[PDB]
Design a protein around this motif. Structure first.
Motif, PDB file in Angstrom:
ATOM      1  N   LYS A 253       0.847  -1.176   0.000  1.00  0.00           N
ATOM      2  CA  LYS A 253       0.000   0.000   0.000  1.00  0.00           C
ATOM      3  C   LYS A 253       0.888   1.232   0.000  1.00  0.00           C
ATOM      4  O   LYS A 253       0.288   2.494  -0.020  1.00  0.00           O
ATOM      5  N   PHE A 254       2.031   1.147   0.677  1.00  0.00           N
ATOM      6  CA  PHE A 254       2.968   2.266   0.768  1.00  0.00           C
ATOM      7  C   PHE A 254       3.752   2.514  -0.504  1.00  0.00           C
ATOM      8  O   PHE A 254       4.635   3.371  -0.534  1.00  0.00           O
TER       9      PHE A 254
ATOM     10  N   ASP B 297       2.058   2.810  -3.619  1.00  0.00           N
ATOM     11  CA  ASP B 297       1.019   3.271  -4.525  1.00  0.00           C
ATOM     12  C   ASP B 297       0.978   4.807  -4.465  1.00  0.00           C
ATOM     13  O   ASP B 297       1.852   5.425  -3.858  1.00  0.00           O
TER      14      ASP B 297
ATOM     15  N   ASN C  26      -1.266   7.263  -3.517  1.00  0.00           N
ATOM     16  CA  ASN C  26      -2.085   8.036  -2.587  1.00  0.00           C
ATOM     17  C   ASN C  26      -1.434   7.896  -1.222  1.00  0.00           C
ATOM     18  O   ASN C  26      -1.057   6.723  -0.802  1.00  0.00           O
ATOM     19  N   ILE C  27      -0.789   8.950  -0.740  1.00  0.00           N
ATOM     20  CA  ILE C  27      -0.076   8.849   0.542  1.00  0.00           C
ATOM     21  C   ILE C  27      -0.998   9.048   1.766  1.00  0.00           C
ATOM     22  O   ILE C  27      -0.526   9.357   2.853  1.00  0.00           O
TER      23      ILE C  27
ATOM     24  N   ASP D 170      -2.688   6.729   3.122  1.00  0.00           N
ATOM     25  CA  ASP D 170      -2.474   5.786   4.185  1.00  0.00           C
ATOM     26  C   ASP D 170      -1.025   5.736   4.637  1.00  0.00           C
ATOM     27  O   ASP D 170      -0.759   5.291   5.763  1.00  0.00           O
ATOM     28  N   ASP D 171      -0.047   6.314   4.202  1.00  0.00           N
ATOM     29  CA  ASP D 171       1.329   6.375   4.657  1.00  0.00           C
ATOM     30  C   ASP D 171       1.420   7.372   5.816  1.00  0.00           C
ATOM     31  O   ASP D 171       2.171   7.161   6.771  1.00  0.00           O
TER      32      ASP D 171
HETATM   33 CA   LIG Z   1      -0.478   4.695   0.133  1.00  0.00          CA
END
Ligand SMILES: [Ca+2]
Length: 130
Positions: free
Chosen positions: A83-84, A86, A88-89, A91-92
């Motif tokens: 996910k990290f 991709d 779109n940050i 969720d980071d």
């Molecule tokens: Ca992300």
């Protein structure tokens, strides 16, 4: 291929309430991103000081912060490491907030310690429109 520019990342984290998050200014968060990943959302490092891998714009390790397979993981952020990687940050940031809660604060990021902690960052974002 999401690669940020300082002022863009800044306006972004400034809208996620990062400015002052856990007593840390907006310049510190950015400064951290610049030296950890060079603002690259797809940055990867597979031979960290430890032995696992660091993922994304904030280089979140896979031994403590996200889940994978190569090895176990406390996965304290409860999210897969991919996910990290991709663009779109969103969720980071949520996971980087969890990190600073630990005892060592933003020193969890060696690069922030090397080129950010001891520096005068009062003008680090001066050219930015926020
Ligand atoms: Ca992300």
């Amino acid at each position: 291929s999401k690669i940020f520019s300082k002022c863009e990342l800044a306006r972004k984290l400034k809208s996620m309430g990062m400015d002052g998050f856990h007593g840390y200014s907006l310049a510190n968060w950015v400064c951290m991103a610049e030296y950890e990943s060079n603002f690259n959302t797809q940055a990867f490092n597979g031979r960290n000081s430890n032995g696992s891998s660091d993922y994304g714009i904030f280089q979140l390790n896979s031994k403590w912060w996200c889940k994978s397979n190569s090895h176990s993981s406390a996965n304290a952020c409860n999210i897969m490491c991919s996910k990290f990687l991709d663009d779109n940050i969103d969720d980071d940031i949520a996971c980087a907030k969890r990190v600073v809660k630990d005892p060592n604060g933003m020193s969890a990021w060696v690069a922030w310690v090397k080129h950010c902690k001891g520096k005068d960052l009062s003008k680090y974002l001066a050219s930015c429109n926020l």
